[PDB]
Structure formats: structure tokens, C-alpha cells
Amino acid sequence: QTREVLDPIVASLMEAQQIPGMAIALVRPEGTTISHYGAADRETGTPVDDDTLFEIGSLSKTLTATLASLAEVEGKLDFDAPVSRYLPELEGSAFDDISGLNLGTHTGGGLPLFVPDEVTDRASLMAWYREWQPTEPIGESRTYSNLGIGLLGLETAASLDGEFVPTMRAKVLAPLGMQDTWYDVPEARMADYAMGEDKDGQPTRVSPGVLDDEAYGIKTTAADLAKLVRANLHLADVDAELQQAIDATRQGHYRVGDMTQALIWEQYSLPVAPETLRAGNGYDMILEPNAAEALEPPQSPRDDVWVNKTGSTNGFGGYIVMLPGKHTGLVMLANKNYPNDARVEAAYRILSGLGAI
């Protein structure tokens, strides 16, 4: 059926990229198909199954974005407001002039990609935010940042008078039915925690770091992710306020060349050539600052677009594509950090093989 298009491509991908295991989820209007390939851990050879848990890296940011969007829908968070309104420990800093919307679109004034070594806890972090000097015109330039979305995670928790992880579980994960989604994987499920493989073939797992939960910390199953995707595609039964929150994550906020930056989500209009997608998910977009044009009346969720997000850790590589107009989406989790190029090619072949493009 569906699985005839998918199995040869995945096989080819895993062989070409030396991927121990993958878990894939295809979301269609007539149902969601889950598929498991290879081993959860190369050394032991344990198969990937329904319960297998994957690091999703920066894919976590879609969750963070969603919870931010819900606090907005509940009228507890204004995206246009200075971030210091909700984190008064940052009054007087650059964040009097930087908004939650900026942070959610990586247009917060040049905020760097990584958390500095100097920063080792909340106090030292807030301190650093207070000290930091913007290096790019706020709301005009895009630099992919963990400090940025990490801070939006903090701002959101503050505006909801709760702690991040429990709030996330209560307001987003539980209602979406995401019962296998963990920030800290419990001892009981450690057997189901896949082992990573880095690009030198060594086994890796993610270490704790500051802002990990907010920026890259989730471990989960392809099915659970498929619930988030199902909701974006209007294929799930979900609270009205939550469904508004999710939809707003897909609002166009900035034009960045061929890419439109939604709230975390990144999208390309259709039809789209793989090269556009390789470039948009490549070096010039991820690791350089890019001019960004504010879409002033925001722009509603589009039905003629390729929406995606990549995510990685040293040992895992995830990718999510959504076609809102075709009510189709794809989740590809792997326990190997393989190139974004390969992710884009695989996702593309798969989706045209099913005539969603």
C-alpha cells in the first residue's frame, strides 16, 4: 500500500547514511501509518518498536512554540510585548525591546545559536541576558538561536505562573494524548531509550545543559509526534483553545528569501524544488544571519505550502514535514545525526511517491 513506497526509500536511506534505527509516521486523512526499522541500539541490536524513545533535538521547539501560543490564546501572554514585562529580572536590558514574537521567529536582535560555557544555571543565564548587546537590527534579521526559543520557554512559564515541564505536560502533551513524551526519561522506560550514533559512529546520548528542556530536550515516539502533526492538519479531536494555539504557530511572520518563518515552523510555498529545501535547511540559513521582512498583517495558515522543522542532537536526527492543503504529514525519527540534505531528499521522494506533491 503506502508501505510499498516507503520501505525501499527508508532502506536505501538507512544503508546510504548508516542509520541503525528509524521510526516513521505518515499522517493521512484516512489514518496514520507507523513504521519501525532497524535497531534501537546498534551494540545490542534491540529492534525499534512502538515503545522506542528517540531524542528529537530542536524538534522540541515546536512544542515550546505551541505552549507559548496557548498562553497567548488564553490572554496570559502578549507576543508583541517586551519580554521584560514577564521576566522583570531583565528590566533595563536589551529585552525591553525584544518581544516573544521575535524570540519565536529568531528575529531577536542577533541572539546567538548556542548557550555560552560561562552560563551554567538560571542565575548565570539571566545575568548573561542582562549583559548581552544586540548585533543585528531587531525584527529585521534572522539568526537561528537556542537562547532565543529557550527564553521564550522561560517567558511562557512565567506568564502561566508555572514551571515549564509540568505546564507543558498539563496544557499541551496530555491533551494531545502524548503519554510517551519525556523531558527526563524515567528509570522504568530506560530500556526503551534508543542509543544515539554520532557521525564518527560512536554511541552518544544527550547531556544535560542549560535551556535543554526549552530548546532540545524531548525524547518521544513517532506516534506521539504524529499526534502533534495530526492536530496541525486538523485530523484530531482537540480543545478549541488548543486548536487555535496550534493553528497560530503556522502563521507566517517573516519572509526570509524563499522561506517564510512561522512560529518555529518554517515553510516554503508550493510547488517546491528539493534544492530550495536543501538550501533552506542548510548552512546559509542555519549558521548565518539573514535579512527578514516582517509580514505586517501576519498571514494566515496557508494550504499551499511545505512546512517543516529539522531537529538534532549528536546522536539523533529528526525531521517533520506537513502539507496542510493535502492534510498529509510525515515524521522521521532516526538514532543517527545524518545530513539535512538526506532528510530533505527522503521526505521529498516519499511524499511525491504518494502523490502529495
Residue numbers in the entry: 8 to 364
Authors' own words:
To evaluate metal-ion affinity and to identify protein metal-binding sites for Sr2+ and Cs+, a class C β-lactamase (BLA) derived from the moderate halophile Chromohalobacter sp. 560 (HaBLA; molecular weight 39 536) was chosen as a model system. HaBLA, although a moderately halophilic periplasmic protein, has a particularly abundant content of acidic amino acids similar to those in extremely halophilic proteins. The crystal structure of a halophilic β-lactamase from Chromohalobacter sp.
WT-HaBLA crystallized in the presence of Na+ and Mg2+ but without Sr2+ and Cs+. The tertiary structure of WT-HaBLA was determined to 2.9 Å resolution. The solvent content in the WT-HaBLA crystal was 44.6%. The tertiary structure of WT-HaBLA contains 12 α-helices and 16 β-strands, which is the same as in halophilic class C BLAs. From a structural comparison of these five catalytic residues in WT-HaBLA and EaBLA, only a small side-chain rearrangement of the catalytic residues in WT-HaBLA was found. The r.m.s.d. for side-chain atoms between the active sites of WT-HaBLA and EaBLA was <1.4 Å. The active site was positively charged owing to the existence of Lys68, His113, Arg149 and Lys316 even in the negatively charged circumstances of the overall structure. In the vicinity of the active site of HaBLA, we also found a hydrophobic cluster composed of five hydrophobic and aromatic residues: Leu120, Phe121, Tyr290, Ile293 and Leu294.
